[PDB]
Amino acid sequence: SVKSEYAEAAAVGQEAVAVFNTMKAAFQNGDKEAVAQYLARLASLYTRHEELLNRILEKARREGNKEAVTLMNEFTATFQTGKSIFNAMVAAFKNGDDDSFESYLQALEKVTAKGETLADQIAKAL
């Protein structure tokens, strides 16, 4: 069901949370080789999550589930904010700009924490 597809998407999201926190520890410790690998892993995870969320939204649309569509439109918009900040973080790593990297890292945490009440709302709506 669309609900079980959302649970699969939620787990992929939690995997990115786990890798992100590991990455943050590596950055603080100066282990740039580790950071590079974690950023690659995160890119692949976010790409997967993005695709799953799109399939969930498209299915809710085909089902006529208006409330779930509303919530998923809001959630996918916030996802794109996180993606843009993530991409900027990757660029800051490439460029050696640790000040920008720290900034983007905190921003991405706050955007992610904010979007969590909506994430739980969607589960209940599908």
Ligand SMILES: NS(=O)(=O)c1ccccc1F
């Ligand atoms: N989980 S999020 O903040 O919407 C997000 C989406 C895509 C990339 C990085 C991110 F942080």
